[PDB]
Symmetry: C3
Subunit: 109 residues, 3 copies
């Protein structure tokens, strides 16, 4: 897919490359960047301060993730372990129905 | 002096002292037909984030509030369908709703 | 940081450039490059990134909620106060036991 819009409106402000990619400010408070690739090199940090950020594609995080609010995953997640309320899911047990202990989490069957 | 681009309505992109790049607007739309790469030690979103395809995380993840998912495959084992060796040497049934 | 990359101005470049050396540059072959110490984006309503893949080389912190439509692969441990899996609390889940009764809730590993 190639998307290099060229329309301009009265009052637009921008940075424009002759190949067609650009950064544009236009009416109704909109900033629109249209290009092949965006690279950000920020020595210290990037902050995105907005009520909602949406990524339409895949996201890869090469170090860690922290989330303060609730997370909703619509498809399966995979992890080597999930520590849930201090308890390893991989190795958790239960008090069994005869008052002993079960073995650890096992493969479905 | 600063460098920047400014719209009459008030939104702008500015470069200013101490290596700051500042974008201030109502909406930001980034269209990148191939990819976006953000090379920085820490990225912080102050609001919600929605990812419409998949997520991959190499490092540890810390969720401070509950997560929800149709299944979590933990060390190769379905959480939704997992069982245990029972306390009498048989097998339990699969994960069931809390009592 | 990834260094040793081309940074010299080419014919046709368009940008904004601060005296200190940070910059936003558009260069050949459809490339946009932001180089600085800090990036601060503020969008009063929303930000949308429409791209097949977004990569963050460092840590990410999300201060409100996260939603993911596709599959998620976590290569290291995750931690949460609870995981509601197919409608069932992981923290509090039970099983039918091996003797016709029911087990207690999830307990710490041995
Ligand atoms: Ca039993
Ligand atoms: Cl049992
Ligand atoms: Fe269990």
């Amino acid at each position: 897919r190639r998307y290099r819009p060229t329309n301009l409106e009265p009052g637009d402000a921008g940075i424009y490359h002759h190949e067609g990619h650009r950064i544009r400010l236009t009416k109704d408070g909109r900033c629109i960047i249209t290009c092949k690739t965006v690279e950000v090199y920020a020595d210290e940090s990037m902050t995105v301060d907005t009520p909602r950020t949406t990524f339409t594609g895949d996201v890869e995080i090469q170090k860690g993730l922290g989330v303060k609010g609730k997370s909703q995953f619509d498809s399966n997640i995979t992890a080597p372990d999930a520590i849930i309320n201090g308890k390893s899911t991989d190795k958790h047990i239960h008090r069994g129905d005869s008052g002993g202990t079960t073995g650890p989490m096992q493969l479905e069957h």
